[PDB]
Design brief:
Elements: H1 19-34, H2 55-58, H3 65-73, H4 80-97, H5 103-119
Helix pairs in contact: 1-3, 1-5, 4-5
Bound molecules: the ligand COc1ccccc1S(=O)(=O)Nc1ccc2c3c(cccc13)C(=O)N2C.
Length: 125
């Protein structure tokens, strides 16, 4: 069974746009999105569709790049670190739920390397 997807808007949370957050949407996310291993991470895990009934019994802070994309498009984040933390949650969830060497983990490890490459240098204020 699927829990509700993570929020992509929250009127109680203040919004902000920065050069670094614009970069994270325009170059980091949009480039990762085109990677050949991106497709498993482009939407929230649908436990019913993918036949993973234990996913949300294990993973209590789900995150995906479709959620991050909508958050960036909506200026949901206060700063780039909050967005980077969502990316890191997405990668760590994959390592937590699976085991080393699994095909999905190899996909996540390659995307994580490309992500770290791209956020190594951010634009300034
Ligand atoms: C049951 O399906 C599969 C079984 C084996 C390999 C691949 C798939 S899958 O790619 O078709 N389904 C999945 C999509 C997204 C994810 C996972 C994870 C673990 C296992 C499956 C999947 C996971 O951490 N994420 C983010």
């Amino acid at each position: 069974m699927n829990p509700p997807p993570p929020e992509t808007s929250n009127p109680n949370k203040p919004k902000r746009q920065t050069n670094q957050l614009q970069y994270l949407l325009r170059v980091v996310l949009k480039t990762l999105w085109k990677h050949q291993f991106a497709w498993p991470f482009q939407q929230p895990v649908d436990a019913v569709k993918l036949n993973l009934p234990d996913y949300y019994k294990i993973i209590k802070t789900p995150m995906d790049m479709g959620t991050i994309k909508k958050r960036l498009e909506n200026n949901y984040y206060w700063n780039a670190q909050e967005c980077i933390q969502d990316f890191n949650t997405m990668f760590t969830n994959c390592y937590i739920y699976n085991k080393p060497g699994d095909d999905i983990v190899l996909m996540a490890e390659a995307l994580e390397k490309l992500f770290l490459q791209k956020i190594n240098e951010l634009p300034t204020e």
